[PDB]
C-alpha cells in the first residue's frame, strides 16, 4: 500500500536522502522503532544508513540518509504511508 | 514620499502585536533599524552546503512585513528560522524541520494567532503539502509565494497546498510581474496577487540602507503583513474567515488577464490585496474555487470548499463545450461539486462557490428527468442559493429549471437573515455576463436552459460562455 515519490524537476532532486512518512496516528515510539528496524535490516544486507531526524508533532516519520536500493525494503516496513526522496527549495 | 506598494494596499477609505509572524528564509540582519528589537532570531540552522549577501533576502522580507518606515504591519513581532543558505537554496526536509520547530515552540510556549511566511518554492511535494495541512489544522496561518517561474502554481510546493494562502506578484501598473524571461506564477492555486515589483525594504549592506527587490516573496510578505493586521483587529478569525476577508477587501478586475496563457485566464483570480477600510456588521462572504481539470477520460472533476465553508452553488466549464454538466452531492456530511465530461471531450472543470454561512446546513434537492425538470426550496427561512444540472446522455422564486432530459439540483440553505434575488440577462455572442448590484454577493451563477461552454462566477459577476443565451445570477445580502 506504501508509495514512493520523487520531485518531477530532475535538477531539483536530492537522491540518497528520503523522508519516510508513517500512518496518521503512529506514535513517536513506533516511528523510532521503525527507523531502528530499517537500520538493522540495512546492516544485515551490508548498507550504511544514517537517521538524520525523527519527526513528531506535525507528521510521524523520519529522515534517512541511505542508498535508494533499500527503498523496496523500506516500503515494506510497518506503519509506512509513503516515502519521498528529498528535493531542493529556493528563495522566491 | 510614500512607496507605491504601501499606497496600493491602502483602501479608498481608511481610519489611518498580539500576532507573531514566523519567517522561514535565509539568515537576517536583526540589528537593521527597520526591525531592531522586534525580530527574534532563533538561529535554528537547517541549510545545505553552499555549492550582507547571505542575509539579503531575509532582511528585505522582515522589513516588508514589519519595518518601521517601509513595512506593512509596522512594529509587528517577528521570529526568523534559517532554512535557506547563502545562495537562497534549501531542502524540503529542512523546511519540514523548521515547520515542526514552529509547532513545538507553540506547544511549549503558547501565544496568540501565528502567521507563517514561507517565501520559498520547490516542485510539487506530497510531504511538504501534508506538513502545511497539519500546521494549518493546528490553527496556524500559512502565507506562501506562488513562485517566480511564470508557470501554474499547482506544480509547486508549498504554493499548491490547499490550506495555505498562495500569493502572486503584481507591479505599479497592476500587471503580473515579469522577472526577465520568467515572472509570477498563476492559476487556480493562487488566492490573490499583491505588490511584488520594485519593493523598497531593508538592505543587509548596512543598518540604515534600503534596496528595492522583486518577486512572489515580496508579494507574500505584503499579505502576511495584511493578515497580521486583520488578526490583531479580529483575533478569533479562523483561516477560512481570514482568506474570505483578504479576497473581499482586494481590488477587483485591475489585472489585464491577456498576460496569462489562454487556459489560465479564467482560473486565475483577478485580485490585488489591500488592507480593510476599518478594524470593525454581518456580511455574506463568497469566493470561487476551481477544481483540477478532470482529464480526457467518463472523466469527472471535483471542487470542494475548505473546512468552515459552505458550498452554495456548483457550475462547470469546458473550452470545447463537450460536457454533461454538474451535480451537487453530499459527502461526509458536506456538499461537493462534481462535473462530468462528454464523448470526445478534452475534460471539464468543476467550479464551486464557497461562502461563510454559519449554522446554515445547506442541503441538496434533486429531481431526475421526467415542461422541463423542476425542484424548489419550500421551507420557512430557507433560501435557494444555487441551481445545478447534469445529463446522463450526450447532445419562479426559490425554483430551479433544467432541460427535459436532465437532472436538476438545488442548494437550499437555512438562512432567515438572508434576502436573495435572481437576476437574469440574455443577449442575441461568445460571452454573456450579469453582475449582482453593490452590497449583494453572488451565491450562484448558471446558464438558462445556443450551446454553452459553461458558467462561472468572477467576484460578483456571473459569466456564461457560448460557442438566445441567458446568464442567471443568484444574489444574496444580510437583511
Ligand atoms: C490544489 O488545489 C488547490 C490549491 C490551493 C488552493 C485551491 C485549490 O483548489 C482546490 C480544489 C479542490 C479541492 C478539494 O476538492 O479538496 C481543494 C483545493 C487555494 C486557492 C486555497 C483554497 O481555496 N483551498 C481550498 N481548500 C479546500 C477547498 S479550496 N490556494 C492554496 C492552494
CA distance B472 to B461: 10
Solved by what technique? X-ray
Task: Compute the Cα dihedral for A41, A44, A46, A49 and give only its sign.
Answer: positive
CA distance B172 to A1: 51
- Domain holding B443, by residue range, is 282-479
- R_g of chain A computed on alpha carbons: 13
Phi, psi at B446, each rounded to 5°: -145, 175
Largest CA distance in chain A: 44
B346-375 per-residue burial string, b: 16 or more CB within 10 A, e: under 16: ebbbbbbbbbbbeebebbbbbbeeeeebeb
For residues B215 and B40, is the Cβ–Cβ distance under 8 A?
A: no
Of B252, B281, B310, which one is at a domain's C-terminal end? Answer: B281
Looking at the fold, whether B5 and B131 belong to one and the same domain comes out as yes
Best B25, B91, B99 member to test A by mutation, with max A CBs in 10 Å, is: B91
CA distance B118 to B163: 13
Helix (H) or strand (E) holding B57, with range, is: helix B56-66
Cβ-Cβ contacts under 8 Å, B123 against chain A? 7-9, 12, 87
Cell 481608511, residue located:
B14
Phi, psi at B56, each rounded to 5°: -45, -55
Looking at the fold, whether B317 and B211 belong to one and the same domain comes out as no
B258-282 per-residue burial string, b: 16 or more CB within 10 A, e: under 16: ebbeeebebbbbbbbbbbbeeeeee
Looking at the fold, whether B266 and B303 belong to one and the same domain comes out as no
B182-210 per-residue burial string, b: 16 or more CB within 10 A, e: under 16: ebbbbbbbbbbbbbbbebbbbbbbeeeeb
Of B241, B265, B281, which one is at a domain's C-terminal end? Answer: B281
Cβ-Cβ contacts under 8 Å, A21 against chain B? 127, 130
- R_g of chain B computed on alpha carbons: 23
With CA atoms as reference, report the closest residue to A48 among A67, A68, A62, A35: A67
Total domains in chain B come to 2
Cβ-Cβ contacts under 8 Å, B217 against chain A? 91-92
How far apart are the CA of B90 and the nearest CA of chain A, in angstroms? 5
B287-326 per-residue burial string, b: 16 or more CB within 10 A, e: under 16: bbbbbebbeeeebbbebbbbeebbbbbbbbbbbeebbbbb
Looking at the fold, whether B297 and B405 belong to one and the same domain comes out as yes
Looking at the fold, whether B119 and B259 belong to one and the same domain comes out as yes
Best B96, B139, B193, B197 member to test A by mutation, with max A CBs in 10 Å, is: B96
Of B281, B307, B338, which one is at a domain's C-terminal end? Answer: B281
Per DSSP, the three-state class of A29 is helix
Cell numbers at residue A84, please? 519521498
Burial class (CB in 10 A: 0-12, 13-18, 19+), B472: buried
Looking at the fold, whether B296 and B186 belong to one and the same domain comes out as no
Residues in the ligand 1 pocket, defined by CB under 6 Å:
B 154, 160-164, 166, 188-189, 191, 289, 291, 302-306
Looking at the fold, whether B158 and B27 belong to one and the same domain comes out as yes
Q: A90 vs B155: CB contact, 8 Å cut-off?
A: no
Q: B124 vs A55: CB contact, 8 Å cut-off?
A: no
Looking at the fold, whether B289 and B250 belong to one and the same domain comes out as no
By most ligand atoms within 8 Å of CB, the mutation choice from B289, B300, B315, B335 for ligand 1 is B289
Find the B142 Cα to ligand 1 centroid distance in Å: 14
Looking at the fold, whether B339 and B267 belong to one and the same domain comes out as no
Cell 522586534, residue located:
B38
Looking at the fold, whether B121 and B257 belong to one and the same domain comes out as yes
Cell 527503498, residue located:
A71
Q: How many CB atoms are located within 10 Å of the residue A52 CB?
A: 16
Looking at the fold, whether B346 and B276 belong to one and the same domain comes out as no
Looking at the fold, whether B249 and B371 belong to one and the same domain comes out as no
Which CATH number do you get for residue B319? Answer: 2.60.120.690
Q: B93 vs A17: CB contact, 8 Å cut-off?
A: yes
Which CATH number do you get for residue A67? Answer: 3.30.70.80
List residues of B with catalytic annotation. Answer: 25, 57, 217
For residues B132 and B140, is the Cβ–Cβ distance under 8 A?
A: no
Amino acid at each position: 500500500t506504501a508509495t514512493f515519490h520523487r520531485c518531477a524537476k530532475d535538477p531539483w532532486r536530492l537522491p540518497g536522502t528520503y523522508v519516510v512518512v508513517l500512518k496518521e496516528e503512529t506514535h513517536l515510539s513506533q516511528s523510532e522503532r521503525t527507523a531502528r528496524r530499517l537500520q538493522a535490516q540495512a546492516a544485515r544486507r551490508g548498507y550504511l544508513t544514517k537517521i538524520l531526524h525523527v519527526f513528531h508533532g506535525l507528521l510521524p516519520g523520519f529522515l534517512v540518509k541511505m542508498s535508494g536500493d533499500l527503498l523496496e525494503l523500506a516500503l515494506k516496513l510497518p506503519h509506512v504511508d509513503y516515502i519521498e526522496e528529498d528535493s531542493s527549495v529556493f528563495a522566491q
